[PDB]
RNA sequence: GAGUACACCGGAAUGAUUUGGGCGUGCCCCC
RNA sequence: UUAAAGUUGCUGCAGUUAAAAAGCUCGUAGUUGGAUCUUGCUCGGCGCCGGCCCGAAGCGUUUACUUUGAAAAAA
């Protein structure tokens, strides 16, 4: 949140879920810090950099986190295109 | 697995799948497994599509190798079908095993002796291990469950569709998941057959243990 | 020749030349039993995107059904005469104004803007009839209508979709792309 | 599911759905063409014929009314035809 | 749902998208118009004429081959009945039900059905009076069927 | 039976937004409805949307995002003035820094701030925040 | 004229000759 | 007597079990009702050679809604 002065005033900004585009509260303990390791294109070993995501707890509790992770892998191209 | 052609069925993994039986499942449909499947046939056995199983096995391997320290990966089993497989999986990778009678409050109650704060959970079966999935809600634990056609999809993050009722299927898939994570860690090459034994991760009954050790030397 | 006008304007020399081309085709071929009592109203010049061009043929409404059954050979004859200009047949309908309170007999709904545009889009693609239409409303506010056509008569129509888009952009001003579904039919 | 595409479905689930509940109005009927083996010419009969239909010439009946599709007389062949 | 019934039904015609005379059909407007003329001289309802046409003679819909529907042509001649077919069928059903009541006196359910039918015919007759189809002096009583069956 | 088509459309898209579905089917369609989501999509609350154009009342499929809280209607359509607009947005909105009121106006169906800055008003339709 | 297969002509390819039919336009009858 | 009374609820209450939906149906007012339709034809002016444009006597769907003005006693 900004103001009329021109500097930041809020204490911190919360994260965003990557499926329903909602925030994760400070007392919601079902959040995910999933990282998927992308590899080198000619060898296949781990390079060093990660690829992080976040899914809120209500999507887990309904049970659609797996297809959400599959769609994010489809968008990032980590999983195969035809599948 | 990526568009690069180094991480697919070479010639023999599909043959091992058809020999073990990781392709045919139960007899009831699930609404979260409507795409990891092809068709119900006569005798009522649903057939799981295999490339999707391979892609989520690569996805689970990537999620395991993505974290730097392997000592805080809790592998969980309670059923007698996969007691040996998770123990030798933790021996091969360096994971922390729990085999038989998972204690409630292991991740929640902190003053007890059996306490652990891990970072990743790897579950053999969602229906049998419904208690680690409940304890994975209160603390931020992502999970991977080797799911079936008759397994509810609750509090799960990566689902690998397979028949987790035969000992050969679970032993082979735990073994090749260990193979994939040691290949991605940078210790095992893809060019040569390194393999120790697919039967080395297999659970077997004491009666067949007795009769085959009496028949053999 | 065979060019008629509702008002008092003599047709220009280009449309007169294409009319004399129509008269030498009817004098050439043995179609004089039915093309003799048919007329062409007007034509225009359309500069589509790229190095191509196209023409629109205005046909009056009450004998359009006579033009439908002979359309399959006239288009081929005008491509064999001059292949550097794609031809289409468009029925000419006028648009009556809205009945505002500033300004009379009732305006029929066959002459309204939506009906005229629907009939023009229907008559624009004769060898492939419309099987479905969807409308895209883009983020800036502009609209986009996509047209689905049947799988029949695809070998000679797929190279005309840019010309169809150019004609419909020139006449109406709405961006239209064409697609070919195959699973339903 | 969470993210199911409604822009274009597979034709299989289009065929399982009810005709009013489809994405576009498509009937579940067609026109068929049958002929008597003892006769010579071809008559076009609707699929739900709903009444006793006779070929002109008064030789043989063709269809019998049922609850759904009409029962064809034996020895008569039909073709699925598209306009 | 229904008007006088508690049940709900989803069963009606579903006309296709495409508005075109089919290519396999080899009939113009004039011969099918003359066939409609002949079956009107037979003495059928527009529903019966339409189902006979689409059953035997291979037409998708008359509205897609002619410029209008059946009843406008039937009123363009002038032999179409002064009583519309819906309200005529309601009178026929009502007089059949009433004739069932003068022999079965102790039948309350059939009396209830007759009350529902009289409600239907009044509700349709006020619409036909509103749309200026019938004379305003026309009304239906319990003993007026011999003038209009 | 169905009387307020916009109320049914906004109840359906509110249920779809609550359950996290990315797309939803709206069975009838109107110019007032497509203008209402034109206002919403110009304001950035939603994304792309198609119109299933057929020979009946059309169908609308939308590409929802997570920037939407609630869609509502005001039934029946009360008329407002420029004086009473602040009375409506004081008790109909969660805050004075965001959220909009869509009302029918002779200059076009549009939000409350444009109607304030061109000095006209009319009958009310609904709200979104 | 038959319409399940047949007895035949006028256009058009090469001066003169003519290539199996059916009406459900796409698969059905005689080899 | 007013606020607290969101215990008179138009904003803004309740009707399975605390106060409560007629036994059920039909039925005239009253209420609420599906989608679609994008300005011109007798007198004379700021200019000019029988004339161009503009101005205008006359007319150019009625309603609700919305916006600007008038008229609106003082305390």
HEC string of chain B equals: CCCCCCCCCCCCHHHHHHHHCCCECCCCCCCCCCCCCCCECCCCCEECCHHHHHHHHHHHHHHHHHCCCCCCEEEEECCHHHHHHHHHHHHHHCCEEEECCCCCCCCCCCCCCCCCCCCEEEECCCCCCHHHHHHHHHCCCCEEECCCCCCCCCCCCEECCCCCCCHHHHHHHHHHHHHHHHHHHCCCCCCCCCCCCHHHHCCCCHHHHHHHHHHCC
- Measured CA to CA, the distance from residue F99 to residue F79 in angstroms comes to 20
**E28 CA, G3 C1': Å apart:** 23
Window 10-29 of E, Cβ < 8 Å to C: 17-18, 20
As a rounded value in angstroms, the CA-to-C1' distance for C167 and G20 is 49
N-term to C-term CA, chain F: 29
Indicate the number of domains in chain B. Answer: 1
E115 touches strand H (CB under 7 A): yes
CB contact under 8 Å between D53 and E56, yes or no, is: yes
Distance (Å) from the alpha carbon of C118 to chain D's nearest alpha carbon: 19
Is residue D32 within a helix (H) or strand (E), and if so which, with residue range?
Answer: strand D31-34
Q: Which residues are paired to C136 by β-bridges? A: C144, F50
- Give the determination technique: cryo-EM
Contact E12 D31 (CB under 8 A): no
* Residue E95 domain boundaries: 81-149
E128 CA to centre of own chain? 13
Residues of C (97-126) placing their beta carbon closer than 7 angstroms to any atom of strand H are 97-98, 101-103, 107, 109, 112-114
Geometric angle at alpha carbon A68, from A65 and A69, rounded to 5°: 90
User: Does the nearest atom of strand G lie within 7 Å of D40's Cβ?
Assistant: yes
Q: Stated in angstroms, how far is C132 CA from G23 C1'?
A: 32
Find chains touching chain B: ≥3 CB pairs under 8 Å: A
Sign of torsion over alpha carbons B68, B70, B73, B77: positive
Locate the chain F residue with the closest alpha carbon to E15. Answer: F55
Q: Is the CB of F48 less than 8 angstroms away from the CB of C137?
A: yes
Measured between CA atoms, the residue of chain A closest to residue D2 is A64
Burial E120-141 (b: 16+ CB within 10 A, else e): bbeeebeeeeeeeebeeeeebe
Residue with tokens 């085709």: C25
Q: Is residue B82, in this structure, part of any structural domain at all? A: yes
CB-CB contact of D72 with D53 (8 Å):
no
D42 touches strand G (CB under 7 A): yes
Burial of C8 (0-12, 13-18, 19+ CB in 10 A): exposed
E47 and E58 part of one domain = yes
Query: Domain check: are E89 and E101 in the same one?
Result: yes
- Placement of tokens 């189809």 in the chain: E133
| DSSP codes, E53-104 | HHHHS--S-GGGTSSS-HHHHHHHHT-S-SS-HHHHHHHHHHHHHHHHHHH-
Q: In what order do the strands lie in the sheet with D79-80?
A: D43-46, D31-34, D79-80
CB contact under 8 A, F54 and E17: yes
Cross-chain Cβ contact D26/E15 below 8 Å: no
Chain E residue numbers touching D28 (CB-CB < 8 A): 14
Protein residue at shortest CA distance from C1' of G24: D33
What are the tokens at C171? 């006449």
Nucleic strand H near CB of residue E127 (< 7 Å): no
To probe the interface with A, which of B50, B61, B120, B157 has the most A CB atoms within 10 Å? B157
Could you write out the three-class secondary structure of C32-63? CCCCCCCCECCECCECCCCCCCEEEEEECHHH
C-beta separation of C130 from C147 below 8 A: yes
Nearest to B176 by CA among B195, B149, B192: B195
Chain F residue whose CA is closest to D7? F61
Q: What are C169's two structure tokens? A: 């952009």
Task: Give the nucleotide nearest to C101 (CA→C1').
Answer: H61
CA distance D38 to F95: 84
Q: Give the max Cα distance, chain C.
A: 56
In degrees rounded to 5, what are phi and psi of residue B80? -70, -10
Q: Which residues of chain C neighbour D27 with C-beta distances below 8 Å?
A: none
Tokens standing for residue C98? 């809205």
Structural domains counted in chain E: 2
Which of B140, B154, B183 comes nearest A63 by C-beta? Answer: B154
- Of the CA atoms within 13 Å of residue B45, those in its CB half-sphere come to 9
Q: What Cα–Cα distance (Å) separates residue B154 from each residue in B120, B126, B174, E122?
A: 17, 8, 22, 59
Strand ranges, E, within chain C: 54-59, 86-91, 130-137, 143-149, 176-179
Instruction: Tell me, yes or no, whether E139 lies in a domain.
Output: yes
Whether E128 maps to a domain, the answer reads: yes
Question: Is-cis flag, bond preceding B206, omega within 30?
Answer: no
The closest alpha carbon to F64, from F101, F23, F114, belongs to F23
Q: Are C141 and F42 a contacting pair, CB within 8 Å?
A: yes
φ, ψ for residue B65 (rounded to 5)? -80, -15
Q: Is A38 exposed, middle or buried (0-12, 13-18, 19+ CB in 10 A)?
A: middle
C-alpha to C-alpha distance for F53 and F50, rounded to whole angstroms: 9
What is the nearest CA distance from C144 to chain D, expressed in angstroms? 15
Question: Which is it for the CA torsion B201, B206, B207, B211, positive or negative?
Answer: positive
> Residue ranges per domain, chain A?
1-83
Task: Establish whether D39 is an annotated binding residue.
Answer: yes
Task: Look up residue B26 and give its two tokens.
Answer: 């139960």
Q: What is the resolution of this structure in A?
A: 3.8
The residue from E59, E80, E101 where one domain ends is: E80
Give yes or no for a contact between A35 and B63, defined as CB atoms under 8 angstroms apart.
Answer: yes
**Which residues on chain F are in Cβ contact (under 8 Å) with D4?**
23
CA F112 from chain centre, in angstroms, equals: 12
Distance CA B179, CA B172 (A): 10
Query: Which residues does chain D have within 8 Å of residue C132's beta carbon, measured at their own beta carbons?
Result: 24
- Containing H/E element for F56? none
- Residue C110: give the domain boundaries: 1-185
Please indicate, yes or no, if residue E126 is contained in any of the structural domains.
yes
* Residues E111 and E66 reside in one and the same domain: no
For B116, the domain range is: 13-217
Residue pair B149/B26 in contact by the 8 Å Cβ criterion: yes
């Amino acid at each position: 949140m900004q103001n009329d002065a021109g500097e930041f005033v809020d204490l911190y900004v919360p994260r965003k879920c990557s499926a329903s585009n909602r925030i994760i509260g400070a007392k919601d303990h079902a959040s995910i810090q999933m990282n998927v390791a992308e590899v080198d294109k000619v060898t296949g070993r781990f390079n060093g950099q990660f690829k992080t995501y976040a899914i809120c707890g209500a999507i887990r509790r309904m049970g659609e986190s797996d297809d959400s992770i599959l769609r994010l892998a489809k968008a990032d191209g980590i999983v195969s295109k035809n599948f | 697995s990526g568009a690069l052609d180094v991480l697919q069925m070479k010639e023999e993994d599909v043959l091992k799948f058809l020999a073990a039986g990781t392709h045919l499942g139960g007899t009831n449909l699930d609404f979260q497994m409507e795409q990891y499947i092809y068709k119900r046939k006569s005798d009522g056995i649903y057939i799981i599509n295999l490339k999707r199983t391979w892609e989520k096995l690569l996805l689970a391997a990537r999620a395991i190798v993505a974290i730097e320290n392997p000592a805080d990966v809790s592998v969980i089993s309670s059923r007698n079908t996969g007691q040996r497989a998770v123990l030798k999986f933790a021996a091969a990778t360096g994971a922390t095993p729990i085999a038989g009678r998972f204690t409630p409050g292991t991740f929640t109650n902190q003053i007890q002796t059996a306490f652990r704060e891990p970072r990743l959970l790897v579950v053999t079966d969602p229906r049998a291990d419904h208690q680690p999935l409940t304890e994975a809600s209160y603390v931020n634990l992502p999970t991977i469950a080797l799911c079936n056609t008759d397994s509810p999809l609750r509090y799960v993050d990566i689902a690998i569709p397979c028949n987790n009722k035969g000992a050969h299927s679970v032993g082979l898939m735990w073994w090749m998941l260990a193979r994939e994570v040691l290949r991605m860690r940078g210790t095992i090459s893809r060019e040569h057959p390194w393999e120790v034994m697919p039967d080395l991760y297999f659970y077997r009954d004491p009666e067949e243990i007795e009769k085959e050790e009496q028949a053999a030397a | 020749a065979k060019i008629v006008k509702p008002n008092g304007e003599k047709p220009d020399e280009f449309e007169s030349g294409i009319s004399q081309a129509l008269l030498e085709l009817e004098m050439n071929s043995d179609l004089k039993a039915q093309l003799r009592e048919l007329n062409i109203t007007a034509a225009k010049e359309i500069e589509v995107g790229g190095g191509r061009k196209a023409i629109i043929i205005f046909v009056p409404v009450p004998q359009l059904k006579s033009f439908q059954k002979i359309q399959v050979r006239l288009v081929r004859e005008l491509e064999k005469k001059f292949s550097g200009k794609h031809v289409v047949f468009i029925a000419q309908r006028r648009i009556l104004p809205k009945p505002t309170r500033k300004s009379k007999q009732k305006r029929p709904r066959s002459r309204t803007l939506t009906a005229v545009h629907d009939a023009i889009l229907e008559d624009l693609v004769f060898p492939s009839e419309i099987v479905g239409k969807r409308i895209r409303v883009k983020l800036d506010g502009s609209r986009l209508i996509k047209v689905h056509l049947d799988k029949a008569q695809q070998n000679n129509v797929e190279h005309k979709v840019e010309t169809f888009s150019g004609v419909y952009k020139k006449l109406t001003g709405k961006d239209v792309n064409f697609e070919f579904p195959e699973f339903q039919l | 599911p969470l993210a199911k595409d409604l822009l274009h479905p597979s034709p299989e689930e289009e065929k399982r759905k009810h005709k009013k509940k489809r994405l576009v109005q498509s009937p579940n009927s067609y026109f068929m063409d049958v002929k008597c083996p003892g006769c010579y010419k071809i008559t076009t009969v609707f699929s739900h014929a709903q009444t006793v239909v006779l070929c002109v010439g008064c030789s043989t009946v063709l269809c019998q009314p049922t609850g759904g599709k009409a029962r064809l007389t034996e020895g008569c062949s039909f073709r699925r035809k598209q306009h | 749902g229904r008007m006088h019934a508690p049940g709900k039904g989803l069963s009606q015609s579903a006309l296709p998208y495409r508005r075109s005379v089919p290519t396999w059909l080899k009939l113009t407007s004039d011969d099918v118009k003359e066939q409609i003329y002949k079956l009107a001289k037979k003495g059928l309802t527009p529903s019966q004429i339409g189902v006979i046409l689409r059953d035997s003679h291979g037409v998708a819909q008359v509205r897609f081959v002619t410029g209008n529907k059946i009843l406008r042509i039937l009123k363009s001649k002038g032999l179409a009945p002064d009583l519309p077919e819906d309200l005529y069928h309601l009178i026929k059903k009502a007089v059949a039900v009433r004739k069932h009541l003068e022999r079965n006196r102790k039948d309350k359910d059939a009396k209830f059905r007759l009350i529902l039918i009289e409600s239907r015919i009044h509700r349709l007759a006020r619409y036909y009076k509103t749309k200026r189809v019938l004379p305003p002096n026309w009304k239906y009583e319990s003993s007026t069927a011999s003038a209009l069956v | 039976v169905r009387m307020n088509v916009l109320a049914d459309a906004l109840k359906s898209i509110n249920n779809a937004e609550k359950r996290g579905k990315r797309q939803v089917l709206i069975r009838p369609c109107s110019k007032v409805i497509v203008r209402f989501l034109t206002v919403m999509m110009k304001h950035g609350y939603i994304g792309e949307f198609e119109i299933i154009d057929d020979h009946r009342a059309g169908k609308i499929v939308v590409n929802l995002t997570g920037r939407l809280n609630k869609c509502g209607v005001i039934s029946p359509r009360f008329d407002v003035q420029l004086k009473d607009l602040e009375k409506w947005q004081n008790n109909l909105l969660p805050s004075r820094q965001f959220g909009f009121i869509v009302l029918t106006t002779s200059a076009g169906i549009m939000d409350h701030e444009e109607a304030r800055r061109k000095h006209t008003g009319g009958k009310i339709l609904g709200f979104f925040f």
